[PDB]
Each structure stands twice: as structure tokens, then as C-alpha cells.
Amino acid sequence: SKLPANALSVNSKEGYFVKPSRTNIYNRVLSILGEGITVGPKRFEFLAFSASQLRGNSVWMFASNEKVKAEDIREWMGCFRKIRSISKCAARMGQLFSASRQTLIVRAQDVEQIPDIEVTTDGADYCFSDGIGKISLAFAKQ
Amino acid sequence: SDLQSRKNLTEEISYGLREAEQVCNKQQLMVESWRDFLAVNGEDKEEDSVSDLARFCYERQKSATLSELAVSAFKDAYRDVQALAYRYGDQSNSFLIMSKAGSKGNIGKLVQHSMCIGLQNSAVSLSFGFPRELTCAAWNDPNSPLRGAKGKTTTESYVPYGVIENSFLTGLNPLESFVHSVTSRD
Amino acid sequence: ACALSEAAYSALDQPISLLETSPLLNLKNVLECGSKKGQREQTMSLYLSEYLSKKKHGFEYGSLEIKNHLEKLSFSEIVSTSMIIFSPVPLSPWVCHFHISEKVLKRKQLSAESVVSSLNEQYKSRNRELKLDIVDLDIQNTNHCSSDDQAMKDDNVCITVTVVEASKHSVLELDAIRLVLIPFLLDSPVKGDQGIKKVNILWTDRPKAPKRNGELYLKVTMYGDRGKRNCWTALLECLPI
Amino acid sequence: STMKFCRECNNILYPKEDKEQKILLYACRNCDHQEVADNSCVYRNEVHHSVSERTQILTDVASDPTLPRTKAVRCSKCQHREAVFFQATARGEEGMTLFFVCCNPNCGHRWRE
Amino acid sequence: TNRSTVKISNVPQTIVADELLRFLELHLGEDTVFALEIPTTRDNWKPRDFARVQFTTLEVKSRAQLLSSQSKLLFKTHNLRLSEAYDDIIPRPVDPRKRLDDIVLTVGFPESDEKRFCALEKWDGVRCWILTEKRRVEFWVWESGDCYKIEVRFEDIIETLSCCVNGDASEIDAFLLKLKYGPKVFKRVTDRYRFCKEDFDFMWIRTTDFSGSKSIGTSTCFCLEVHNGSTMLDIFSGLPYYREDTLSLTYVDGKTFASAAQIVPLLNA
Amino acid sequence: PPMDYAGSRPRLMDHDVTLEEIHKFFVDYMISDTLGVISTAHLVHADRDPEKARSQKCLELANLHSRAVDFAKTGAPAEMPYALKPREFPDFLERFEKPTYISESVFGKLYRAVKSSLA
RNA sequence: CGAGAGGUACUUUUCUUUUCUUUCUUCUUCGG
RNA sequence: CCGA
Ligand SMILES: [Zn+2]
Ligand SMILES: [Zn+2]
Fold first, then answer.
1. What's the CA angle centered on E227, arms E225 and E228, to 5 degrees?
2. How many CB atoms lie within 10 A of CB C110?
3. Rounded CA gap, A29 and F27, in Å?
4. Residue nearest to nucleotide G14 (CA to C1')
5. 3-class DSSP state for residue A60?
6. D75 labelled as ligand-binding?
7. CB–CB of A13 and D108 under 8 A?
8. Which family does it belong to (chain F)?
9. What residues form DSSP beta bridges with E40?
10. D102 marked as binding residue
């Protein structure tokens, strides 16, 4: 079943204000995420987790073989050093994990950046081009 | 009504004053020097800053704003200590009748008559403080704020702040009577 | 007048604390308020705008950004160790070294270049310092000075103050630099203006000058202007905000 | 501020920079002696603004201001409106985030912005 | 009739728990009150207008309810009114036979193709509380001073047996439990209005396995060795999926599977 | 009129991620996750209270829902307060353990209309 | 007739419900 | 299982 908020990080008022106390389940799940599991002649390392894996308390794991490793598959997706957040750097590593069907590869020369449009009414920032884009008639057929 | 009710009343007063002292010690941390401690982070001195029971009383009397934010922090926590005269007192009590009728007196006079005097402070800057115990051992302490400069660098002026655990019925200590005389001379 | 005097006799003639006053003195200061001089206090009370409530906790952030902008913060409260180091064209034998830790600059929301810019902004606008035949005063910020005196802070910055001499040694005396040049820039603010004593944020329930249709407000205490300018006309120049 | 003593005169010394040698020397005013200086340090002072000695504790000098209080919020544990707000930093963040501290004496709760 | 914890409606606010305890033990029998708790708004100096009392049996609870309904409980000019509480003050089964004291608990799994049992570790002098109303069973395993509560639900048990260690079929001294899921492990960590009659002033937090050899994580089968199981068969018949049959077993030596990793139920590759 | 759209302030660190803060964010996502109770408490506080979806206890829950759905985006928890849980469930729920109560809203009528059909 | 002394003479003159929170560990909602 |  789902792990509750009382099986780990139990609250305990110590001193002036209350403070959450991390029990042995906290240090167990942290040790499993850090070191990994070791079944067979293999060892599974933390790759990433998707957006719905975070709500369902699941995670993806990979074993470092002779060909690739757990770091190479992570840097093959992209470079996450330009994100100074803790939640967004984890959320952008689960963006490329959707249940999809692959199509042909578009080269790096076929990029065209249109300047966006936005409105600012009464001090509140708004935008119309959140994630939209343009595509041709024949590209939908291909 | 009997001796056990008076013993339970004194045991409740002795814990209510100890809780009000902790309320004032909590409220004394609301300054611009403990902003790294009041924030939700990992502090190393979180167990060493709470045990300073005499340093907080020394810092409350040396400055004028920390005593002003602690008098108001004692006076609202004492509203639950003053609410014990209606539980233990009977409906045929003459002081409760004269206080609920509004003819003469209030509950603040009955608390000092029966349970405890409470907060004793003066609005004038003097050259001595109160040793937070008002006992015989507190008067003979050489590193006490009652004598003068405690050496924490010397001290020049104090704002007197003292709580009397006794009342006007059980009798006051000579140090507690001196504290009451200083706070009532004005 | 009888209804006011009857409230004047039956009032508490004892002060509550050292910060406040008696209810009798508070009535006396209100009734005898036309003295047109005294103590140079001139306390003001600024309010907040209506459009600041469009953000999450916008009033608290606005009051904190105001109190961070128009409060005086001297240069002496930022430095930790001042020294004079014989550095040796050099053109100056004495260089004032001001070492500042990197924690108080992040705590007061300052930087190593902003304090040099605000020191130059007070040097180029205040001629109250006595004349030592000074033509220029350059300030060189350095995060690691080579002054081999006491290597006790490896995570602090240094500020070197150098006086420009007019091809002579009439400025090179130590006593004048120690007594005039050092307290001039140490009593100069790096944040806010010079004529504001203290700013505190207060919460009120029945405020003066009510709105059209409980709120947070600030209480600015300004220094007494010795010139002909008013304290309100100096508070208005609140030009960035 | 750093004072030294003469070798034979046993008097005070004064710093005297030699313009023809571009060095620092300490010359005795009474006896004709010019000693070699060391480390070029002629002044050192831990900057303490306590210029009002034995008078700062009588009147409120306000060397430690109070934190402001607001009543336009509500705590999570208790349903109290009064709360202490201030600005600080986190353990590893970069910037300044708003914190809150409840004013209720029995709540003991604190939360971020 | 499920719980014995009774909530008194109007207690005086000028009393202590000892004055109510002596009053209840004067009106009812001697030391018939197990737990007593007066909730406080403050820490230790402001009791509330009600209190919770837990008795030792149901007969004294019904007698106290009959005395309260007839208005025969006058404590300092206050008529006590009894009602029903929400839960027990201490999760303890109200049965003198269900609280098995000083028994032998051993863990393991069937090793061979027969109905044998290999023991990894052995726990001596443990408690056993069969909570029928809460539908769970709990054990108190003391190890290196501190104790660890091991909660086992009724839905996790899929096969209840009746074994015999001493060989004789009439000497039923073991009860084999088969757990589908795993048990919840707890830990004990470390004053005026609470009497409580025993040592229960602590708290339970969910921790990991306490054994140094980590035997509990690979302990899907249990074996409750009792002192003398003769009339306990009527109590153990209330366990779900209880096979009504006596069957022997063999205590195999099983200290070989001793790993030190966090992931316990793995074969040595 | 509509509600606000800007969420909480983002939290930027002064260094790079050392692959342990992601572990801490994944483990601390289990605790302080009150996303499962906001939509329940809003649905009960709209059934038990008249002038539904316009009272203050509905506006605080609507703000807490918009703050809780951004917990996967930014690291700001929801912090569901006390004195806002209903402690009583309506008729159109499957919670047969809580001390429920007969719902007088349109949801109780729609729940009884299917019992009138499966009879 | 003016000066110096001691004495009567402001007494509580504004604290607010005395009923304010610990019965806790509990389903996110939609479409493939 | 996946996408707001
Ligand atoms: Zn330097
Ligand atoms: Zn609160």
C-alpha cells in the first residue's frame, strides 16, 4: 500500500518549535536510492523518475554494463546543469519518458525560432504561446 | 475547600509560572539577531540556546525593548493563570462576588491575595536587577544581577523584572518584599 | 474644558514602560502641541498602495523592500578590522585597509562593488571633511590582499583606500589620516540616506488618514535638518520607490 | 596605534618613512636611533562602535531591532492571525525567502513563503 | 462491549488523577482500574472537564455504568455521567487468557519438502496480545534493553496450524503462523494526571529490522511456541484460515542464511 | 471573477545538483503530500455548508489545491491545516468506516437515484 | 505682618467571556 | 502505465 506520512519523518516538538524526526525508514530509503540494490551479478543505479512516477512513489533504475553506464544514459538525454532548482531538475529528467511512438529524425539545421507574443495587463504577466507551434500540411502526413 | 485542593492549586500555579517563563523566553527570540535560528533550517545551537535560563533574564533587564516585548508576553500568558480563581473558588466567595458585581476590586487583586503576586516591574532604569529566584541562595550569589555588574563587559543600568511565586497570604520573603517595595515605590 | 480637565486629574501619572509614556503626559503632549520647536524628531508615517495586494504576501515584501531601501546603514557596521599598511608611481605611502567578511555583505544584501560605489558617492558629494590637499581618492576592491599582518580570514574581502597627493609629502602624515580620513568614510552610509534614524513596520487597526473603502504601515524617524529644508521635502527625495 | 620601545633610550618610537630608501623606519625622538620596522603595520583596530561607555543600557540604543508582525495570515496548527515575518536565507538556496513565525504561545509552528 | 475505556462526562477541574482513582476504587473493587487519563489544554497545569478511564474487565464496566445511570457516583458534589469513548487508552485485549506472557517466539521457513522448520533466530520471554476488536496480533520482543513491537494483522495470516515441539501429539506446545505479507515493526523511544498502572509512558515509531542477522525480513513463516496449549485452542480458533488438525514438525538448524545487506531475501550468487 | 495564476517563488541554489538533492526531493515527496485530501475536503465543505463554492473555507481549499498541484514543479508543500477537515462524510462516498451523515445536497439525490434504479 | 518646618489631602480608577486547538495513521480528480 |  501507499507509504503514509507517519511511517517516516515523525514530528516531535523539541526545544521551542516542532521538528520532524527522520526514523530508520528514512535512512533506509535514502541508502537504497544512494547505493542501490544488488541482485545477481549486477547493481541497479538511480537513473531518473517520470512525472507520474513521483506521485506513485516509483523510480527507474539501470545497471552499469560494459557498453553503457547509469551516467551515460542520463547525459544522453541532455545537460541539466543550467537548472538551479531541485524539483525542476528532477522534473525535466522525466519529461523524456512518455509512452510514445517514434518517427523520423529532424536534423539540427531545420530550426526556425519565431519571436513569441505576450500581454501584461494590470501588472499580471500573461502569455499566449505556452507550448504551441507550427507544422506544415505534408509534415502531418509524414 | 480543603488542604488537597490548596496543594493542587499551588502545584498548578508553580507550573503556570514556569510555562509563562518559557513563553517569555520563546517571545524574546523575535529579534533581528536570531533570524538564522527562527528560519526553518539546520541549527547547531538549537539545544544550547534553550537551556540559557539566566542569560535570557540578564539580557531581558539590560535592554529596554526586550523587557517591553516580555512584559506583554507575560501579561497575556498570565490571563490563564488568573483564570484559576473561578475553578477553585466557590460561588459564596466575597471577593468573587465583589469582583463580578464591579463594586470594588477585580480578579487581579484576588490572584495576588490568594495564589501569587505575579509580574513585578518598574518603568525606571535602576542600577540593579533581579536574580530570577528570590530565595536565600539568590541573594548571596556574587555573579547575580542584584549586586551590580555581573561581568557578561560591565553593566551600567538595569530594567527590573521579577516574578514572585509567593502571595500575600502565605507570606513574602525579605528579598521578595524588597522587590515589591522597589516596584511599588513609584 | 471641564470635561477634559476631569479626565486630566483622573489619569495615571506613572509611565507604563521606558519606550512609552504616561497617559497624562500623552494628553499633555497632544494638548500642548503648538510649541513649533523641540527635539528635532519629526516622526512620519508612510502607508502602502492598493496594487501591492495583487501578489502572494505582497504587502510584507513591499514593506521589507521599503525598509531595506530607506534605512541608514553605516560603513562601520559592515567592516570588522581596519588597518593602515605601508605599501611601498605609488604616490602614497599610507593605504587604509578595510577587511569585510563575506557573511555580513550577504546578510545585509550588499556586494563588494556597491560599497565602493556608495563610498565614492559620499566622497564626491560631501565636502565636510577638512582639506588635506586631496585631488582624488580611488578605492580598489580586492578579494585577497597581500598584507602579511594576520591571516585569520580566508573567506573575506578587502577594501584599499588610497589618497592622491599633489606631487608632494604634505598629505603623508599619519595622524591626520588616522584622525580625519578614517572616521569620515566610516560614518558614511552604504545603504539608505544620511538623515533617517530608524524605520520600523507596524500593524494597526484604527489608523490616521483612513482609506476610501487592519493594514501594515511604516513609521519613519528622520534626523533634524539643520538647514532650511523640511524633513518631508527630504523624505520625498523615495524617488526610486 | 601599535607602539614599540627604544633599544637604549627605552622610550616611545615614531614611524618615519625614508623617502630616499622607500622603506619604513622607527626613529626615537629623544635619542638618535633609527630602528628597522617589521611587516609595515602602523595601525590596527577592531572596529567597535561602543563610543557611549556606561550609558548605552540606560536609554534604548536599539542595537538589536524587533521583527515586524502581521495579522493578514493564518497559521496551520492554530487558527491565529498574528504572526512574525522576517527575511533570511535557506541552507543551500541563493537569494532571500520570506519566513513566518506564529505568535500564539501554544502553537510553535513556523513555515516559509 | 468491544472496548472497556469509559469517558466520564463531568469531572471537577480542581482534582488530580489519584483522587478520582481512589474514588473509583472505593466505589468499585480494589485495583480494578487499569488506565486513567485526564486531557490537558496546557502542558501540566490545566485539566479539562472530562476524563477517560479504562477498566480491567467488562463486568466492572457494566457495574460502573449501572451505578452512573442510577445516579450513585457523587464525587465532590458532582454526579459522574459515563458514556462511550472513541478508542482504548492502551491497545490491550480485555481477556486474562489472551495475554500470553513469557513465551518462546521463533522465526523461519519450511526448509525441505516435508513440514519442517529451520530457525534463524530465537526470542525468549516475549509477549503476545491477540486484539480481536482491532483485528491484529502484536508481540513484544525485548533485545538489548529496548523492546520492538511487531504488529501482525489478520489479513496477512493465511494458514494457522497447531504444532508440537516435544513430539507427543497431546503436548501441543507450538502454533505455526504463515504470513503472506510482512509485519509492521515498531520501536520504543524515550506525569501527574496519568496513573496507567504500568510502564506505558513512551511512543511507537516505525523503524527497520532490529536484528543484527536480519532474520525478520526473510521470516514469512512464524512458530509461536507456547508453554502449555490445552484450552488455548478455543482462542486460536478465532484466527482466520485455521486448519483444525494437529501436525508435527522438525526443528532444523538454520543459522546459515545470515546476510548484512539492506536487501535481505536474496540467494547467495 | 477568476482567481490568481502566479504560483510560489522558485527556489534557486547557489551550486549544482550533487545527485543527492534529487533523492531528498523524492523521499520528502511522500511526506507533506496532502493532495489526496484537498479535493475531498472541498467536496464535503460544499455539501455541508450553504452558499457552496463561495465561502472562505472553499477559497482557502481552492488556493491550496493550486499550490499542491505545483508541488511536482516547485518545492513548495501544501500544508493542509487543522480545523478544516470535515470529520463527517456525505452519502455519496465509499467510506463505510467514518461516522457518515445523510447528504441533503444534489449529490445525495444523484446517489439515491441509482439505488432507485438498481432495486 | 513676612519666612523655615512638619501634617490632612489622587482610593483599584480599567483585567477581560472564566467555555479558544490534539478522537489520532489515512482514498487527488480526469482520458487512453 | 502514461499526459494536465
Ligand atoms: Zn587588506
Ligand atoms: Zn499558529
1. 110
2. 17
3. 7
4. B106
5. coil
6. yes
7. yes
8. Belongs to the RdRP family.
9. E47
10. yes
Q: Are C46 and C62 in contact (CB under 8 A)?
A: no
Q: For the stretch E124-161, what's the b/e string if a residue is b when 16 or more beta carbons lie within 10 angstroms of its beta carbon?
A: eebbbbbbbebebbbbbbeeeeebbbbbbbbebbeebb
Own/partner contacts of C25-34, CB < 8 Å, gap of 24 or more, are C31/C4
The C-side interface with F (CB below 8 A) comprises: 54-56
Contact (Cβ atoms closer than 8 angstroms) between residue D95 and residue D89: yes
**Three-state SS for E1?**
coil
Closest partner CB to F79 (pick from D90, D94, D111): D111
- The answer to whether chain F touches chain B by having 3 or more C-beta pairs less than 8 angstroms apart is no
Resolution at which this structure was determined, Å? 3.2
Closest alpha carbon to E27 in E1, E48, E53: E53
Q: β-strands E251-253, E117-131: how paired?
A: parallel
Q: Is D24 close to C85, i.e. CB distance below 8 A?
A: no
Place of cell 533570511: D88
Residue count (chain F): 119
Helices within chain C (DSSP H only): 2-9, 23-31, 58-67, 102-107, 112-123, 174-176, 182-186, 231-235
Beta partners for residue D83, in sequence order = D70, D102
Nucleotides of G under 7 A from a protein CB: 10, 12-29, 32
Separation CA D112–CA B113 (nearest Å):
46
Distance CA E209, CA E121 (A): 13
The values of phi and psi at residue D45, to 5°, are -155, 120
Please check whether residue A29 is in contact with residue A7, taking contact to mean a CB–CB distance below 8 angstroms: no
Q: Residue A7 corresponds to which amino acid?
A: A
B-chain CB neighbours of A21 within 8 Å are none
Whole-number CA gyration radius for chain F? 19
B41: its cell numbers: 533550517
Give the three cell numbers for residue C28: 499633555
Cα–Cα nearest to F84, from F32, F119, F49, F33: F49
Q: What is the 3-state secondary structure (H, E, C) of C161-182?
A: EEEECCCCCCCCCHHHHHHHHH
Looking at the complex, does the CB of residue A82 fall below 8 Å from at least one CB of chain F? no
Question: Counting Cβ atoms within 10 Å, is residue E27 exposed (0-12), middle (13-18) or buried (19+)?
Answer: middle
Task: Return the H-helix or E-strand segment holding E35.
Answer: strand E33-37
DSSP state at residue C195 = S
| Beta carbons of B41 and B132 less than 8 angstroms apart | no
Which candidate, E162, E141, E163, E161, places its Cα nearest to that of E151? E141
* Spatial distance between the Cα atoms of E190 and E4, rounded to a whole number of angstroms: 28
- Per-position DSSP letters for chain D, written without gaps between them: ----B-SSS-SBEEEEEETTTTEEEEEESSSS-EEE--TTEEEEE------STTTTTTTT--SSPBPPEE-S---SSS----EEEEEE--SSBSS-EEEEEE--TTT--EEE-
Residue linked to cell 538454520: E254
* DSSP 3-state of A99: coil
Q: For chain B, give the DSSP string.
A: --HHHHHHHHHHHHHHHHHHHHHHHHHTT-BSSSHHHHSSS--SSTTTSSS-HHHHHHHHHHSSHHHHHHHHHHHHHHHHHGGGHHHHS-TT-HHHHHHHTTSS--HHHHHHHHT--EEEE-SS-BS----SS-SHHHHT-TTSTTTS---------B--EEEE-S-TTT---HHHHHHHHHHH--
- What separation, in Å, do the N-terminal and C-terminal C-alpha atoms of chain D show? 49
Q: Are the beta carbons of E34 and E90 closer than 8 angstroms? A: yes
Strands (E), F1-119: none
**Alpha carbons C105 and A27: distance in angstroms, whole number:** 37
Structure solved via? cryo-EM
Task: Please name which of C72, C73, C66, C108 lies closest in space to residue C218, comparing C-alpha atoms.
Answer: C66
Give the C-alpha separation, C169 to C176, whole Å: 13
Cell numbers that stand for F93 in this block = 462516498
Q: Is E251 exposed, middle or buried (0-12, 13-18, 19+ CB in 10 A)?
A: middle
